[PDB]
């Protein structure tokens, strides 16, 4: 039986302040994670929690844990967003198993997602390249080998042609810092159209472009055309899409071969959702790369999830430090994240700090 | 609607389905995102029989098996406690049913839901110039197309732009967009409201470039510059304000953002363009009232379905901030729309029963029996 439910926001910081992206402004350095602490049968479990009010909590207390689940042992829709993470943790805690085992040493590819438009104050290309190269080198030093570069400078934040030229310079530049083995992804946050996309792609013929992410809002006809154009020129770049307010027909479009990599968020729709979705995508030969940005907890959940998903691509990694949330069990090495074999999600929350924050700025 | 006159005795006796075919006056070319649209048109139509009387209208998402389950239900059963057509029946039967009510009461639909004269615009200016290498030849052709509309009474024009997104190189395509828009503006004169529709082929900066290049022109609205985004539209609106450039932002056709109306109430989007067939007429009656309550404008999308033009006309009586009927000149066999006429940029809607469209009973019977289907007796 669910006995108690506690809630708290935890705070910390990104290792380096994130600049603008193709569509909006500076993302900054401050980070937060909403967490719930559940208690079932005397033992506590921790995890990401969203869409949960004290009123909502009131109406769950006393419900049999068994009642939270589906026939197929799949946490029920109504509970996922608010409790799927604390529950999974609590399960792992009780059975002393890591969630990836509950859902099956674990080693997962990851990439550095922290390369935003950090060069907008610079008139000189070389200064801008050196700056972005240096940011990439910073990730390399921490064990990153793969890099997702924000592009679309010309969409909103710089003049069109100038920003596009700058996009192409930064990506090449970073291509050189990374090495031949380094996978480069580019993410335009919808700031291109099809012909801009082709211009940028053609200019990057020599670069180890692994995938193109959100070039423009997903469109079956445009992506069909783009895949053909790419095929005709022998340029091997995957089409990635799916974060945010996605087209309701996106999965369908992927099954027809217009999109290769699906990027639904690791918190919304979340973990339980991704497990079922992951199965569907494997069956179609489609790839899974759960989006994660703005929530540090998501990085580590994505890690565990790869166990449940054959065609899992990468963990999306942003170097973040949240007070009270010990993630030292995880290590970055050679373009991969090593998930600890410890109980639950392998994350060690400081019970005292959380208890304080629960009283001060949360509820129970 | 006033449903007090409906007798409990009145039942759905028969539902029949046919596809009507026809042609637009001029073949439509590509738009910013896809290829040639062509000249061929169709309209899926149902004929419903209730209490021995028939009504006709657009019908989608209806199978024989669906209709089989409606036969024998009372007309009253199709309505809410609020006198609203139930959601489950709207796409399949709202048009046949509204037409029927009009036939029974001897009233046009606009009277049921309230000489009706509604602004319209000519939507037929597609990328018809893509075979012309020369910009001057392209401008001349597009002007010619606008004047064909003008000769038939159109005064306001919606111009497809976004040539550089896919079909032409980016820079050349955008130069061409601008020249085309100026050219048509010239032809339409000061009274002409000019609309531009990018079909999502621009980004924010391309949009700004085009708008600045067209500061001169009488631009009434900018439609689907890029896929709706609150942040980008907030920026665009503020940018237009500083320039004193009075152009409305229009969006909402196709698979729209679920938050679009929310963004509109916060002032990022001015004109809402949900389609006249899906989500449909009943939906629009309720939505229009909501948009009016927020001081927002309604311009139901209609393209690919001629029937929707006439529906849009009658809907206008139910919506205070109704902008325009989106007009495409189409002839559908067996669908007599001669009660309607275009004069001085307005569509005149007939005061005749139902939607005022006279279907060829015999032709429709033939199509129903040859290629369509029938349920009931
Ligand atoms: Mg992205
Ligand atoms: Mg997308
Ligand atoms: Mg449109
Ligand atoms: Mg739109």
UniProtKB/TrEMBL annotation, chain A:
<feature type="binding site">
    <location>
        <position position="218"/>
    </location>
    <ligand>
        <name>Mg(2+) 3</name>
    </ligand>
</feature>
<feature type="binding site">
    <location>
        <position position="218"/>
    </location>
    <ligand>
        <name>Mg(2+) 2</name>
    </ligand>
</feature>
<feature type="binding site">
    <location>
        <position position="213"/>
    </location>
    <ligand>
        <name>Mg(2+) 1</name>
    </ligand>
</feature>
<keyword id="KW-0479">Metal-binding</keyword>
<protein>
    <submittedName>
        <fullName>Mandelate racemase/muconate lactonizing protein</fullName>
    </submittedName>
</protein>
<feature type="binding site">
    <location>
        <position position="241"/>
    </location>
    <ligand>
        <name>Mg(2+) 3</name>
    </ligand>
</feature>
<feature type="binding site">
    <location>
        <position position="214"/>
    </location>
    <ligand>
        <name>Mg(2+) 1</name>
    </ligand>
</feature>
<feature type="binding site">
    <location>
        <position position="243"/>
    </location>
    <ligand>
        <name>Mg(2+) 1</name>
    </ligand>
</feature>
<feature type="binding site">
    <location>
        <position position="214"/>
    </location>
    <ligand>
        <name>Mg(2+) 2</name>
    </ligand>
</feature>
<feature type="binding site">
    <location>
        <position position="187"/>
    </location>
    <ligand>
        <name>Mg(2+) 1</name>
    </ligand>
</feature>
<feature type="binding site">
    <location>
        <position position="241"/>
    </location>
    <ligand>
        <name>Mg(2+) 2</name>
    </ligand>
</feature>
